[PDB]
Every structure is written in C-alpha cells, then in structure tokens.
Amino acid sequence: MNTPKEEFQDWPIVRIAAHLPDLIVYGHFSPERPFMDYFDGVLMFVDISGFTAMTEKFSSAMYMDRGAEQLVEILNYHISAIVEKVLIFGGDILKFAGDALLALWRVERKQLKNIITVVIKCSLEIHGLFETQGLDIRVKIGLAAGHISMLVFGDETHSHFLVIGQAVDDVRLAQNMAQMNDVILSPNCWQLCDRSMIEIESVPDQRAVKVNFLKPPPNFNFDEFFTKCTTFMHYYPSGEHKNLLRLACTLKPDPELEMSLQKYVMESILKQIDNKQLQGYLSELRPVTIVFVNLMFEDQDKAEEIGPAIQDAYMHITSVLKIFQGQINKVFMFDKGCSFLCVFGFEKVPDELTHALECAMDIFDFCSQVHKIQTVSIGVASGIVFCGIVGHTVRHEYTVIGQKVNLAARMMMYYPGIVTCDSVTYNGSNLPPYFFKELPKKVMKGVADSGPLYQYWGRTE
Amino acid sequence: MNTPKEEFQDWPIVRIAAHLPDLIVYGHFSPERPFMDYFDGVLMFVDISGFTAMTEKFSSAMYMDRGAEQLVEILNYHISAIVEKVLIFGGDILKFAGDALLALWRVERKQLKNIITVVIKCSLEIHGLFETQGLDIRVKIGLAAGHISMLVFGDETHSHFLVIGQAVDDVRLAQNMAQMNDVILSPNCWQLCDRSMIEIESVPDQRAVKVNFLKPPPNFNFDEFFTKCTTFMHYYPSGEHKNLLRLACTLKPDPELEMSLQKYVMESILKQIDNKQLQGYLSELRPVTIVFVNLMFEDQDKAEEIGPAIQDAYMHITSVLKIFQGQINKVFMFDKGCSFLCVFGFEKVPDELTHALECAMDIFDFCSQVHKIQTVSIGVASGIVFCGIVGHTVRHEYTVIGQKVNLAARMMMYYPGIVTCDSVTYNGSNLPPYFFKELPKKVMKGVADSGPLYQYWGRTE
Amino acid sequence: MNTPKEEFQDWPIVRIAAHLPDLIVYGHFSPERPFMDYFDGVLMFVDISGFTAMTEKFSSAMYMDRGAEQLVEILNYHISAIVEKVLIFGGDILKFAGDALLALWRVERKQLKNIITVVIKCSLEIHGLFETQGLDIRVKIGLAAGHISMLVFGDETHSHFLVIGQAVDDVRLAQNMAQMNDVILSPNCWQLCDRSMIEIESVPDQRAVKVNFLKPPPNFNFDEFFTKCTTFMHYYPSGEHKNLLRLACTLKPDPELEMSLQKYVMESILKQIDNKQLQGYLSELRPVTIVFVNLMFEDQDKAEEIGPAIQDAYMHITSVLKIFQGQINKVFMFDKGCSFLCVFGFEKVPDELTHALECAMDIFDFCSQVHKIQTVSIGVASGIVFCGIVGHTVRHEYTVIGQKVNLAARMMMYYPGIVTCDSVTYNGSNLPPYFFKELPKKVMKGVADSGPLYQYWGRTE
Ligand SMILES: Nc1ncnc2c1ncn2[C@@H]1O[C@H](COP(=O)(O)CP(=O)(O)OP(=O)(O)O)[C@@H](O)[C@H]1O
Ligand SMILES: Nc1ncnc2c1ncn2[C@@H]1O[C@H](COP(=O)(O)CP(=O)(O)OP(=O)(O)O)[C@@H](O)[C@H]1O
Ligand SMILES: Nc1ncnc2c1ncn2[C@@H]1O[C@H](COP(=O)(O)CP(=O)(O)OP(=O)(O)O)[C@@H](O)[C@H]1O
Ligand SMILES: [Ca+2]
Ligand SMILES: [Ca+2]
Ligand SMILES: [Ca+2]
Ligand SMILES: [Cl-]
Ligand SMILES: [Cl-]
Ligand SMILES: [Cl-]
How many Å apart are CA A110 and CA A115, to the nearest integer? Predict the structure, then answer.
C-alpha cells in the first residue's frame, strides 16, 4: 500500500487555539463563573518600547495609506521571534498587552529554582535579538516567581481569564524598574533562583535586582539541564511532534472544547477564522475612543475576595457597553487592580464621544457600590490607534496600540477615584463645561502630550 | 545549476477535479447525451448514522451561531479518514450522498474475487475507526460486486453521472439490511469473494450475508497480495507520485478537459474555486425546501432503456426548476429508481413554498407521460437543513444534510405515485385545503416526527 | 531544546517583490526623478504568439463565462516554465509585456562572452519546451548583448523603470526578424559570443544571425562552466538558499524598502496583497479603451537626453489621466521610442470613449511641445481585452492581452505623428465626423482586421 504524507490540517479549533494559551486550551474546569485555580510558576513580562511613537509616525502621508499593513508586518516580525524563543524554551504566552506580552512557566513548587535558570537564559536570548539592530525600538523584561492564581470570569457567551498574585505584581513592578534593554528579577525571584549561577547588580532604592549575565558552573551543559526541566513541563512538544512550536497545533475537532474556547475570542476574529471575512480588514489605523477602567481592592492578591467582585463588575460592564456599542478588548491586572480595556468604534457610530463618557459614568456608579471595590478609576482617550492581530502564526491575539491607549492607562492611575477624559473627547462631545471639570496638568510617564485633561463631572451638579 | 523544489500547484482544474471521481476525470467519452458505458467492479456504500440528529442539535443556541462551522469541521474530520482509507486501498469515491458515500473499485471480470478481499479488508479498517470512539455516531457498510453501468446525461452547460445495475441495487439493499456497525455482502458478492478467507453469519429472511472477520490462509501477506491487485488498478498513485492520494492532484491545465469537468460542478462552487467568493459562505444552516423526485421503471437495470428517459426527464426538470429558482443537488439510483434531489432557496426568494409545490406538480405531469416511466414519486419537505462541502481536501462534494432531507426521501418511497408535502410546506403556503389532501400517518424509517403529511392535489378538482 | 521547522513566511514585502525584478528590489538609488544608471549585460526577449487569438476565442460561449480564469491558468502554466528556466539559469525577468517578457543577465564588461553561452543554452531549453506540444502557440526569442542604461522616473507616490540602449533596440529588432520557433542573435551579440561553440545561418538582408545549435568543445561540462559564471552573478540563490528560485523570497520587513517598492505596483494589486480583496477579481475579460502613447527622440540611446523628457512627459500623462480616470499599465522602449500603455475602464465609467480621445489630444499637445521629443504617436483601440496577473508565483506582473492591445500598438507605429482611433471608438463616441478624419486602410503586422481607422482631428478645425 501507499503511505501518503499527512498535510498539517488547519481546523477552526486549531485556528481558535492560537488566540489562547495552553493554560486555557488544556485547562479543563467548571463552567461556573467566577472560577479560581491556584498554582506556582515563573512569569516573564516582555515590553517593547518606541512602537506607539512608530504607530503615530505610520499614520503620516509617507506610507501612502498602508500604515496599518506596514505596522503589523514589522511589529509581528519582531514579536514572532520573541514568541518563538518563549515557546521553544517551554513557556506559555498568556496575554498580548499591545506591544508587550506576558509569558508563564507553570511548574510544581520545588522545580522553580531550575526553571528560573531557563527563563533567565530565555530572557537573555530575547534581549540578545535587539542589541544587534526597527531603528529605535528597545525592550524591557521583568521576571518574577512564586504563587500565581488564575481567575476565569464571564457570562454564557463570553469568557475572560487573568492571573493574580504577588508574582503578578512583582513581575510588573520589576518591568517598571527596568532601564532600556535590562532584565530585572523581583525580590522573591533571585532568592528562588540559583544564586551561584546568576550575577547581579543592585537597583537604587529597591530590593529587586538586575541580571548582568549567567555564570554557570564548570562542566555545565544547558542542553542537558534543559532536558531535565522538560520532564516537569506538561505540554512541551515531544517525540513525533517535537518539530512543532505548540502542542495546540495537533488539536482535533471537539465541539465541546471549541464551544468553550470560542467564548474567549471576539466575534470579528471568529468570522475571519470561519473564512467569512478577509484577513486584512482587522488590521487598520482607525479613530477610536479608549475607555480604560481600573478596579482596585483592599487585598489585590486574594482570589476568593476579588474574583466575585470582578465577575459582578464584568456583568454590568458588558451590559452597558452593549447598549452604547462598546467592546472589552482585554482584562488584566494593572498595578494593584484589575483593568478592563474597552474600545468604542471598533461598531462605528456618530456621537461615540457622547456615549463613551456616559458609559464611563454608568460603569463608575455601579462599580463604586459593588462590595469590596475600594477605588474605581476610569480614563478616556480618543484618536487614531492601531487595531490588529499581534503575535506568531501559532500564538497571536487581537490587540490595540497607540499613544491614546497609553494616555487612558495613565489617566486612571494618575487621576484615581474619578472618570477622566482627554481634550479630543471634551471638545468633540458637546455637553456644557458644567458637565466637565478642567484638571491640573500632571507630568505623566510614557506619554508625549496630554493637552487639557478633564474630569467628567456628570449631568447633575 | 540549482534544482529548486517544485511546490504543489493548486490549479483550478485540480480544484475542480476534487469534486469528481476518477471515473469522470479520466473518463473520455462522447459529448452526446445520454451516454452509457458498461464495466465490472466492486461497490462499497458507507453510511454514517446520527448526523441528522446532530445537525438538528447544532441549530440550537449553545453553538452560538457557529453550528454550520462546527458541523462541517467534525463531519469532515471523520469522513476525511474514511475517504483516505478508500483512496489508499485503491478505491474511487463516486458520490457523496449527504453523510453517506459511494465508492467503486473498477476492474476486469476475472479480478473481482481478488478485489473483494481488498474491499472487505478496507471496509473492516473503516469500521475499525469508529469502534474506538462524535459520541453517538454509527456506520453501516454494504458491499456488492458484479456488472455496473454508468449513465452520463445533461444539457450543454451541465452534466450529471450515475451508476446503474444489479450491483448498484445489491449494495443499497445490503446497506439497508446492515445493523449498527456491520458489513453486509450481497448474494452475488461472497459468491464472487474467496470463501476460504471470509467468515460469515446468515441474515434472517435474507440471501445476503454479514462479514464477521477475515481468516486469511497461513503464509498470507496482505502487503504483497495488495501489490498484485494494484497491477489491475489504472490510476493508483505510483512511482514518483506514490506519496499522493489521487492521481488527479497531478492534473495540468487543459481547457478542453476543464470545460468538460466544470459542467458537473455548480456555479456557486466554481466561483469559490476561482477565488471570487469566500470559502465559508457555502457552509451554512439555512431554511430550504427539499423536493425529492423519484422515477421508477419496468426494468431498472436496463441502461439503454432508462437512459433516454432520464435524459428527457432532466431536460424538463432543469427548465421548470430554472423558472421557479430550483437547483439539482444530486442525481442517483435510490431503491429501484433514479432520484433527483432538488433544493429551493439554496436563490433565496419569498413564496418559495408556493413555487416548490407547483413545480413538483409540473415535474410530475411531464414525467408521468414520458415513455418507459412507470411511476413518478415526489416528496417535499421544508426546514433548516445543512448545506456545505463534505469530504477530503482531494475528494469532496457539495451536499445537503438534515432530517427534512430524510423526510422527503421517505415520502416518495412510502407514498409512491403522487406528490407529497410536509406540515411546514402546507401551512407556510396558502392555497386552500381543496388544493391539498390530508394523508394517513405512516410510521417511517429514519425520521423522527412527520407531523401531518399532505398530498398536493392540484389547482383544479 | 526543540529545533522547529521554519515555515516560509509570506510577508507583504515578499509579495510586493514578486512584481519587480532584482534590478529594482536590490537596486538602491537616489529618490530624485529622473534617475539613470549604466551597466553591461545580455538581454533575452521571449515573445509568445497565438495568445491574442486564443484570448479572442476564450470570450466565446463555450467557456461558460470562465474565459478569464481558463486563460490565466493555461497562460501562466506555460509562462511559469519559461520564468523558471530564466531564473534557474541566473536571469532576471525585468518586465512582462503581455504574453511576451524581457529578461536580463547583468554582468561586468569582460564576462559577456561567457554569459551569452548561458543565455543561448537557456533560450534553447525555453524553445525546447514548445517543440513537444496549447495547440497553436509559437515562441520567438531575440538575444542582444552590450551597453544597457536603466531609467527610473515618476512622482512621489508612483515609480516606473525602463531600460535604454543599443542592446535594448537590438534585442527587439532581433525578435521581429525571428521566424516561428527561432533564436536570433543581434550583430553585436555573436561577435561577443564564443564563435567556436555556436553554429549559425545568415538572415536575408540582415546583419543579425539565427542560432541553429550549440557545438561545444570536446571535454566541455556545462554544469562546471555554469558554476564559473555564477561567481559573477550577484543575487543567484546559493548555500542554504540554493533551493529557492529568487533571493527576493528571503526578504524581511523593511518599511523604508517597502515604501520604495510599493510605488512601482498598482493600488489594486496592493489591496489584493494586503488581503483586502479576493484574488480572482483582477483576472477578467472586460471591455476597455487602450491608449497607446509613443514618444520618439533624435537620439533614443542617450539616457541623459531622453530621461528628463520622459519624466516631464510622465508628470503630464499621469495628471491628465487622473482627470479622465486612466491608468498607466506599462512603460517601455518600443521601437525607437518610449511607449506608455494606458488603459481606461480598468475606473469603469460611461462616456469612456469621449474621455479617451480628449486625453489623447491633451497628451499629444503637451508632449509635442516638450523639448527633445521629435515625434508623438498615439493609438486608441476599444474592445474586450484580458486583464490579470501573468507569470510565476515568485515573479509575476499585472498586464493586458488582446487583439485591441496589438491594434493600438501598431496604429502609433504605422500612423506616426498623429492621434488615431479604431472603428469602435469612433462610432461609440459621438463627436461629429468633423472631429475625426477617415484614414486609408494600411495592412498591419500582428493584427487581424482593423476596420475603418480614424484620426482624431480635434474640437476646432
Ligand atoms: N494594549 C495595551 N495593553 C495593556 N496595557 C497597555 C496597552 N497600551 C498601553 N498600555 C499601558 O500604557 C502604559 C505605557 O507604558 P510605557 O512602558 O511607559 C510605554 P513604552 O513601553 O516604554 O513604549 P510604547 O509607548 O511604544 O509602548 C503601560 O502602563 C501599559 O500598561
Ligand atoms: N444528502 C442525501 N443524499 C442521498 N440520500 C439522502 C440524503 N439525505 C437523506 N437521504 C435519504 O434519507 C434516507 C435516510 O436513511 P437512514 O439510514 O434511515 C438515516 P441514518 O443514516 O441511519 O442516520 P442519519 O439520519 O444521520 O443519516 C436514506 O434512504 C437516504 O437515501
Ligand atoms: N501587453 C503588451 N505589452 C507590450 N506590447 C504589446 C502588448 N500587447 C501588444 N503589444 C504590441 O503589439 C505588437 C504585436 O506583436 P506581434 O508579434 O506581431 C503578435 P504575436 O506575438 O505574433 O502573437 P499575439 O498576437 O498572440 O501576441 C507588438 O509590437 C507588441 O509590442
Ligand atoms: Ca508598552
Ligand atoms: Ca444517512
Ligand atoms: Ca505578442
Ligand atoms: Cl492577566
Ligand atoms: Cl450514482
Ligand atoms: Cl523596459
């Protein structure tokens, strides 16, 4: 008989699986909402700098109305290489935060010390890519190890996951401390790490530490040491499938599973995956209204406490967003609180600025009175941001990039406890100035020019 | 010099060839209509059960308006494996009858006895796939060997082929006798088969027999025995091309040939093949009106007798269908008669129920008075049926699946000599009840609930 | 660690690079317009005959409205084989002139003699393809070696390149002399070629010569001799990439470069490359209005003289074309002059014939008064011509084919110094006959039936 070659079949379930991590794909858990699960592991948070400035530049006339297609191409080219090195070293890319991403190495408690050596060596090879030579892009890496807690929340047709814990805080703080082209270990990490191998220098006014270089023992063989660590890695491609990047590529049609997975991904993306829409139309530089919500609590690391609150918060957010036409792009822990990245005009309608401000007030009013929510903080920005699918062929997500996305993210941090909006949203909308308040100009990190920032006061006095 | 790798070129003629068997692709014959050709061979009729119930289930709310895409995926996943095993064992998939399919091993008279061993071993490996574990699907296989007669009919822009003979009757009867997960040999088969190898048990009130297992001679080598049989197989991939499933994959641009082949395939499919339409839009769960015609004769096996009649019948069918907006999905011998599967709203228009009943009457009136047509039987059903491309990448066809397709197929059998319509067609249309007659409720095989079935009586009394 | 296979990534810059030669892709030069660059090399001009007759045939009823898709398929099938043999022998396909194409082997002065042996052996293998057996197609090859001069001209959003020199004239004249299935060397070639190897017969009333066959020295090894010549070839795939046809396939995202390259390609093609348009819709048999401009000079080979003139000519052409809706398909040296192939209704509008004639007059009036332009000659033809992407997957261009394209090309040659239009353009438009003049019927090469040809006289007397 003939033994014909079996072509890699590109099933919808395999296409959908590219938008999610192995954490979710092979994570079988109760459909009850919320849901929590606890485990240990190492977290890597890679952040690329200079792309929002590049995104701003690509809207200019010189790219001849191909700025969105020029941006995805160069953006994905560099991120694909990063994603490969994460996947090849046994990592799981959890989430794509615009030009930044969050990776995870999930392991049992005792095997952290060994994994951090793998994650550190991985992070150095990632940094090694962009020391060579896409002329002004830098990269920041923060590493943290310890207890992590997944939270899965949502309704019957949608689902959203996010990670919680001291490690999730540590990794972000570590990355904020990071200078241009540096690797920062949290205080719990480095303590967990094998201290004989890793050389470091102390950060000023900080208990975290910077990695200079690995100084491995004499007869050390990283190829052998890696193979030991792969024993504890669950879904690392092996045997016949060792040539693959992800085990998710080998998935087979399973209606039950696909129904579960499709809830996490947007309808626009599913239409494209189902071949009922062209691939290029999701990549675009369009005028949107960013609405960056941020919910803070008394104890941010307590999964059983904040889990129910975020579920209650989501159910209201998604409902009021649906009335005005908004959509939740991403949900993730952003500096001591869960943050919903909402977008209007993704759903293009006039009076979008008038809707966005009213919904921010609507969300603020409900979220303030939900139990255990200590502080609600919302930021609103409007302008030309990039929208599109960012990542590798086997691991990518739909995300938004731009200076207005940065702006809205800072506004909720720098102006907490209140709803805030930029100059474009203020003037574009036309409620009287009694509806707003002019705020003092604060100098903000990671943003060029705020202009006059305002606080949406409300309809009544 | 450099010797670069030659990428498999996906020409339109190769794409079109996937919708047809090798019987038609490499069958060069006169363009006169009708056309008959006579030969010997073994027929396998594989039928999957439980998918119309699954199709009904996939229209529910839990699949979140991705039931059509969920269905094709799981359906094709299982059928692809079946198609592979047919193609790898040297078979030719003639036709896809919804979730069922018809295969053919064409050989000279004396080599039947050897081929049936190959077809039986093939059928056992096909049954072997679904004994393991898509939780409630069963499969039925019927096998028949003997004289077969092809009939090619149609007009100048369209063509339709179908097989005729005692073997074509035997194989269907064999499959109807088959219990869940069984292999049934016709009485002519088993007599043709090597009786020393095959063990069987007798079917009650039947001259056909069930296959239990192969009991091959002591020093038998199926790999060697297969290679002998491949000598008599014309188009079995070999040499440089042995890695391919079909020889049709190696086809090269030939306007003459492509003009001949494109007539067999629908315009909707050609538009998709020509890349003037997205792939996903043909896969859909849509409300249609099935019109299942069935023409019976005095001698069903006589190709020279019924061939001209079916040609005359087609020419009227296609003309009156074009007036109302119908389309012939499939034509094939279904239990002692040639049966046209027609579909309305494939061509979406209001008053589609009013058109379907009038055309059934129109077809009935003409077909009754065409010479040699003993009995005309038409069944009409309306509801949500699945439409889409079913099969393997190299061998697939556009077909329809659903409980309403089953219903219309039974109605013409159980209520012969008259036009019949279901409750949905009766009430949806609004001719007075004088135009219809209420029929007695018969218990029908392969259908859940008929409801009140009616007979379309006519305009006049 | 795992070392996964790296799938050929199909970046937009790689897709765009297929529409251009290595001359342009790896040619880094000043953005000033015009730009000239001088070098030596061998030119091959392959021309296929009988396809415009085939194109005319494919518009008939027998192809069932798939003539455009049938034509591209068979056309590209034969041209792909030609393109491969050019690329494999180290050539660079400069331009696709409908069913004809222009190749280039760029080398230093002293290595011509060796390259011509490679080009001749290449041309014989190209001719060898179509001596076997797409029933009435012939091929003509002309070869010329010597000094070549590139000219790059255009505006800020578009660019156009073309080659100038005695070699560029020689190669066209050589091809015009060529009988059906012949290889013609120019007088400078053959003198450059190794005369011991190549056997020839003299052409009547001509200093050019026909190639009969190569008669290589005793212990000659073409595989070894080729490898010597590849030392002087810049971009010939080698090492890890020797399995590729073009080095351009290995291109990596470079915004600067991609901005430069995208100007050469049409917006319609970029939309398709960006996946915002289906591939099939550019392939079509549509009614157009061809406007074939031809600018002649005192010294056609002088790059510094005619370069500025063509730049000045282009800037007016593109502007007046944009008013009426025209588009420049191709620009190239056609028999002693630079020729712009313009097309209307590519931009479908009524009164397209009324626009085309006025623009021809507009272009004629300006171009006549531009310095150094000795003779302006314009031809206008209207009818069903083929439009689509012609070539290989790695090297293809958007071009137009048809008898009306031939007609407009002859009209400007046979009726120089004036604007001319065919019978279809005359009668379809409705300016009074005072606006036109009836011309005498000249017998023209490469066209079937002119009908009454007219001269667009003008609005005033
Ligand atoms: N798509 C997205 N997902 C998550 N966070 C985002 C985001 N877009 C912007 N932000 C937020 O905006 C803030 C900006 O971070 P910074 O590090 O100061 C900018 P950068 O990374 O140095 O260069 P960039 O502006 O090119 O991104 C971060 O706190 C980040 O969380
Ligand atoms: N697309 C199609 N092509 C040909 N015949 C069809 C068809 N859809 C339904 N039928 C007819 O409907 C009848 C139903 O056959 P059965 O075997 O009783 C149903 P089954 O195969 O057991 O499970 P199913 O209902 O999931 O198909 C058959 O006689 C068949 O010919
Ligand atoms: N797309 C295109 N690009 C460049 N020139 C074209 C063209 N279409 C037609 N022509 C011109 O039309 C003329 C016709 O050339 P001929 O050689 O006489 C026709 P042929 O090649 O023998 O068969 P054909 O008519 O199938 O092409 C040439 O001078 C050519 O330059
Ligand atoms: Ca960032
Ligand atoms: Ca069935
Ligand atoms: Ca030609
Ligand atoms: Cl998260
Ligand atoms: Cl049939
Ligand atoms: Cl040119």
Answer: 10
